[PDB]
Design a protein around this ligand. Structure first.
Ligand SMILES: *[C@@H]1O[C@H](CO)[C@@H](O[C@@H]2O[C@H](CO)[C@@H](O[C@@H]3O[C@H](CO)[C@@H](O)[C@H](O)[C@@H]3O)[C@H](O)[C@H]2NC(C)=O)[C@H](O)[C@H]1NC(C)=O
Ligand SMILES: *[C@@H]1O[C@H](CO)[C@@H](O[C@@H]2O[C@H](CO)[C@@H](O[C@@H]3O[C@H](CO)[C@@H](O)[C@H](O)[C@@H]3O)[C@H](O)[C@H]2NC(C)=O)[C@H](O)[C@H]1NC(C)=O
Ligand SMILES: *[C@@H]1O[C@H](CO)[C@@H](O)[C@H](O)[C@H]1NC(C)=O
Lengths: 48, 159
């Protein structure tokens, strides 16, 4: 009745049975890079 | 006279979903009155001298002197069988052998996975090993292949 030839293993990104798939995946949102910097400080008590 | 034995069958290597077929060597058994295996009746038996059932995953044809089968994962591991060699003199020589059935070595990471849905109940097809081997050899012939063992069915589901 039906034949479904599908990829796997090293063919993960490949499907070979034409089902007419219109699937268009979205794009990964760019996350803001958050580098952490801890330089030394002179005392803010110098102000007082 | 009673037939005699020279060479044993060490073990039979089989894999789940794979069809194996073994022809007995011509020097497996000897008799002073026959001298050949092909001219002597050969049967396959269980521990208490019972034959293989029709539904068993391994069968063996005497006229073709050929054993064959296809195992399932519920029958992985060891099994034992006896070869009985009976001459025209009504005397039987016995050899024993062991069969190791392994899981499919490729397992889950196969680069290709063929899938198909058919019509009709899968209950008679699964329940019949004859239907299973006919299906396997029919796929092999559909590809034009000779060695039907190149097919490894992995899973059948009632739909
Ligand atoms: C699994 O897929 C492979 C495909 O790679 C199948 O093996 C292929 O079998 C055919 C025979 O039907 C080979 O054809 C060859 O043609 C050349 C032409 O000159 C000839 O020289 C060879 O003697 C042979 O006839 C084909 O090469 C071979 N593919 C290989 C070896 O990579 C195999 O049957 C499939 N098994 C299944 C579906 O169970
Ligand atoms: C190959 O076919 C078999 C059988 O159709 C599939 O195994 C089945 O998987 C489902 C999904 O988990 C199981 O359903 C549930 O299983 C749990 C235990 O895991 C059970 O407690 C539930 O009551 C329910 O039955 C089902 O039992 C299981 N059948 C078995 C193990 O015989 C399998 O997913 C298929 N694999 C592929 C790659 O198609
Ligand atoms: C068929 O495949 C089996 C793999 O189990 C291999 O041993 C055998 O040589 C193949 N047949 C031929 C004619 O090459």
């Amino acid at each position: 009745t039906s034949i479904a030839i599908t990829g796997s293993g090293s063919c993960r990104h490949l499907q070979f049975i034409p089902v007419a798939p219109p699937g268009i995946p979205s794009s990964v949102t760019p996350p803001t890079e958050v580098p952490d910097r801890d330089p030394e400080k002179s005392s803010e008590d110098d102000v007082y | 006279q009673r037939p005699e034995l020279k060479n044993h069958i060490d073990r039979v290597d089989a894999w789940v979903g794979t069809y194996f077929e073994v022809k007995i060597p011509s020097d497996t058994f000897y008799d002073k009155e026959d001298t050949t295996t092909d001219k002597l009746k050969l049967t396959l038996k269980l521990r208490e001298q019972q034959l293989v059932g029709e539904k068993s995953w391994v069968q063996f044809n005497s006229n073709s002197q050929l054993m064959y089968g296809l195992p399932d994962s519920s029958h992985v591991g060891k099994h034992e069988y006896f070869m009985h060699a009976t001459d025209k003199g009504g005397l039987s020589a016995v050899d024993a052998f062991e069969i190791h059935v392994h899981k499919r070595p490729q397992g889950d990471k196969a680069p290709a996975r063929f899938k198909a849905k058919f019509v009709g109940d899968p209950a008679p097809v699964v329940n019949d090993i004859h239907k299973k081997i006919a299906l396997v050899k029919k796929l092999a012939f559909a590809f034009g292949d000779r060695n039907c063992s190149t097919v490894t069915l992995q899973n059948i589901t009632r739909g």
